[PDB]
Motif scaffolding. Structure first.
Motif, PDB file in Angstrom:
ATOM      1  N   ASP A  17     -18.293  20.545   1.306  1.00  0.00           N
ATOM      2  CA  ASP A  17     -17.121  20.345  -0.425  1.00  0.00           C
ATOM      3  C   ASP A  17     -15.300  20.720  -0.135  1.00  0.00           C
ATOM      4  O   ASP A  17     -14.754  20.671   0.031  1.00  0.00           O
ATOM      5  N   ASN A  18     -15.692  22.011  -0.463  1.00  0.00           N
ATOM      6  CA  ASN A  18     -14.161  22.681  -0.341  1.00  0.00           C
ATOM      7  C   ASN A  18     -13.445  22.689   0.990  1.00  0.00           C
ATOM      8  O   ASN A  18     -12.227  22.777   1.686  1.00  0.00           O
ATOM      9  N   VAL A  19     -14.296  23.906   1.735  1.00  0.00           N
ATOM     10  CA  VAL A  19     -13.993  23.762   3.234  1.00  0.00           C
ATOM     11  C   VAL A  19     -13.734  22.379   4.498  1.00  0.00           C
ATOM     12  O   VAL A  19     -12.965  22.466   4.510  1.00  0.00           O
ATOM     13  N   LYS A  20     -14.663  21.401   3.932  1.00  0.00           N
ATOM     14  CA  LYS A  20     -14.594  19.853   4.365  1.00  0.00           C
ATOM     15  C   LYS A  20     -12.917  19.567   3.780  1.00  0.00           C
ATOM     16  O   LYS A  20     -12.385  18.748   5.136  1.00  0.00           O
ATOM     17  N   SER A  21     -12.954  19.578   2.867  1.00  0.00           N
ATOM     18  CA  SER A  21     -11.508  19.430   2.285  1.00  0.00           C
ATOM     19  C   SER A  21     -10.047  19.120   3.248  1.00  0.00           C
ATOM     20  O   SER A  21      -9.320  19.234   2.946  1.00  0.00           O
ATOM     21  N   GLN A  22     -10.468  20.859   3.394  1.00  0.00           N
ATOM     22  CA  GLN A  22      -8.768  22.066   3.531  1.00  0.00           C
ATOM     23  C   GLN A  22      -8.674  21.391   4.977  1.00  0.00           C
ATOM     24  O   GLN A  22      -7.852  21.634   5.313  1.00  0.00           O
ATOM     25  N   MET A  23      -9.784  21.601   5.953  1.00  0.00           N
ATOM     26  CA  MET A  23      -9.829  21.231   7.261  1.00  0.00           C
ATOM     27  C   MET A  23      -9.462  19.896   7.209  1.00  0.00           C
ATOM     28  O   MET A  23      -9.116  19.798   7.746  1.00  0.00           O
ATOM     29  N   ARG A  24      -9.761  18.889   6.537  1.00  0.00           N
ATOM     30  CA  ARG A  24      -8.928  17.346   6.558  1.00  0.00           C
ATOM     31  C   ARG A  24      -7.549  17.182   6.089  1.00  0.00           C
ATOM     32  O   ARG A  24      -7.453  16.849   6.582  1.00  0.00           O
ATOM     33  N   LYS A  74      -0.002  27.673   5.738  1.00  0.00           N
ATOM     34  CA  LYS A  74       0.155  28.745   6.759  1.00  0.00           C
ATOM     35  C   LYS A  74      -1.278  29.025   6.526  1.00  0.00           C
ATOM     36  O   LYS A  74      -2.371  28.772   7.558  1.00  0.00           O
ATOM     37  N   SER A  75      -1.406  29.076   6.153  1.00  0.00           N
ATOM     38  CA  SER A  75      -2.669  30.375   5.788  1.00  0.00           C
ATOM     39  C   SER A  75      -4.520  29.262   5.673  1.00  0.00           C
ATOM     40  O   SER A  75      -4.899  29.649   6.449  1.00  0.00           O
ATOM     41  N   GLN A  76      -4.244  28.513   5.016  1.00  0.00           N
ATOM     42  CA  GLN A  76      -5.771  27.724   5.124  1.00  0.00           C
ATOM     43  C   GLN A  76      -5.868  26.560   6.593  1.00  0.00           C
ATOM     44  O   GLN A  76      -6.807  26.779   6.814  1.00  0.00           O
ATOM     45  N   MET A  77      -4.114  25.927   7.188  1.00  0.00           N
ATOM     46  CA  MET A  77      -4.234  25.738   8.288  1.00  0.00           C
ATOM     47  C   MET A  77      -5.074  26.850   9.568  1.00  0.00           C
ATOM     48  O   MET A  77      -5.522  26.524  10.636  1.00  0.00           O
ATOM     49  N   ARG A  78      -4.785  28.035   9.527  1.00  0.00           N
ATOM     50  CA  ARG A  78      -4.854  29.358  10.517  1.00  0.00           C
ATOM     51  C   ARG A  78      -6.262  29.490  10.073  1.00  0.00           C
ATOM     52  O   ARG A  78      -6.983  29.206  11.599  1.00  0.00           O
ATOM     53  N   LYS A 103     -21.482  29.790   5.436  1.00  0.00           N
ATOM     54  CA  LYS A 103     -22.266  29.598   4.869  1.00  0.00           C
ATOM     55  C   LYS A 103     -22.383  28.868   3.623  1.00  0.00           C
ATOM     56  O   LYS A 103     -23.445  27.703   3.584  1.00  0.00           O
ATOM     57  N   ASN A 104     -22.040  29.074   2.546  1.00  0.00           N
ATOM     58  CA  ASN A 104     -21.348  28.678   1.242  1.00  0.00           C
ATOM     59  C   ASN A 104     -21.749  26.716   0.832  1.00  0.00           C
ATOM     60  O   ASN A 104     -21.778  26.896   0.295  1.00  0.00           O
ATOM     61  N   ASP A 105     -20.638  26.459   1.908  1.00  0.00           N
ATOM     62  CA  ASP A 105     -20.635  24.620   2.260  1.00  0.00           C
ATOM     63  C   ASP A 105     -21.803  24.683   3.266  1.00  0.00           C
ATOM     64  O   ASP A 105     -21.331  23.176   3.632  1.00  0.00           O
ATOM     65  N   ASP A 106     -22.705  25.522   3.454  1.00  0.00           N
ATOM     66  CA  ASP A 106     -23.820  24.845   4.393  1.00  0.00           C
ATOM     67  C   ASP A 106     -23.531  23.970   5.233  1.00  0.00           C
ATOM     68  O   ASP A 106     -24.238  24.046   5.742  1.00  0.00           O
ATOM     69  N   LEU A 107     -22.338  24.730   6.021  1.00  0.00           N
ATOM     70  CA  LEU A 107     -22.445  24.326   7.788  1.00  0.00           C
ATOM     71  C   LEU A 107     -22.547  25.034   8.798  1.00  0.00           C
ATOM     72  O   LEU A 107     -22.816  25.228   9.311  1.00  0.00           O
ATOM     73  N   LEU A 108     -22.965  26.362   8.340  1.00  0.00           N
ATOM     74  CA  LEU A 108     -23.046  27.427   8.672  1.00  0.00           C
ATOM     75  C   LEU A 108     -24.975  28.087   7.631  1.00  0.00           C
ATOM     76  O   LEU A 108     -24.882  27.597   6.892  1.00  0.00           O
TER      77      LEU A 108
END
Ligand SMILES: OC[C@H]1O[C@H](O)[C@H](O)[C@@H](O)[C@@H]1O
Ligand SMILES: OC[C@H]1O[C@H](O)[C@H](O)[C@@H](O)[C@@H]1O
Lengths: 103, 103
Positions: free
Chosen positions: A1-8, B4-8, B54-59
């Motif tokens: 959701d949020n993590v996937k979006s920012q990473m993409r 820069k922050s989000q990319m890192r 974890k919150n995005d269910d990736l872990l």
């Protein structure tokens, strides 16, 4: 959701900085170079990232003014953009000394 | 600043998913495997990203309960984590068909 979006967004942002590092370009040149790479990225996707990267001074632009068409934004990667790009490429490179520990 | 922050965070998040893909691990194992890769990442940096993933269910995690020490979070990469990881690795790979067009 949020993590996937920012990473993409991150991947695409890195790709834009990559494509701009040697040659300055119109958004349409970026779209076209992506097409050659077998990638379709539409204006709706590309435009806000260009704006985001310009706002963080990673890209900058000048208006190309004509009598035949509208003003076009001509984008280049800044000093700050080139340095941050250099950081990221070296970090992907390090991420293969990581790929040894993972396996 | 913001870009820069989000990319890192993204790079570190990808690195965590990379390190977890073969072996489940405590945060301390992740920190240690990073140390072997000549990378220092402190708890203040690592902990919020683990929580975010974890919150995005990736872990996901389970508590390891003892009488000798406190409960420890034992993390693994989920099904969703493994699929998203696969997407990202293939996207870095594509980013070298891009590295041909840049040069
Ligand atoms: O605003 C005009 C826009 O369209 C043009 O075709 C250019 O590709 C782009 O750089 C610009 O943002
Ligand atoms: O809460 C206990 C924490 O410390 C432990 O050392 C583990 O490394 C970590 O997985 C956990 O989050």
């Amino acid at each position: 959701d949020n993590v996937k979006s920012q990473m993409r967004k991150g991947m695409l942002e890195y790709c834009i900085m990559l494509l701009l590092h040697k040659e300055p370009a119109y958004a349409s040149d970026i779209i076209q170079k992506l097409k050659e790479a077998r990638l379709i990225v539409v204006e709706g996707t590309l435009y806000p990232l260009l704006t985001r990267l310009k706002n963080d001074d990673l890209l900058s632009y000048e208006w190309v003014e004509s009598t035949q068409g509208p003003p076009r934004k001509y984008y280049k990667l800044t000093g700050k953009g080139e340095s941050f790009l250099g950081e990221l490429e070296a970090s992907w490179k390090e991420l293969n000394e990581t790929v040894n520990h993972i396996a």
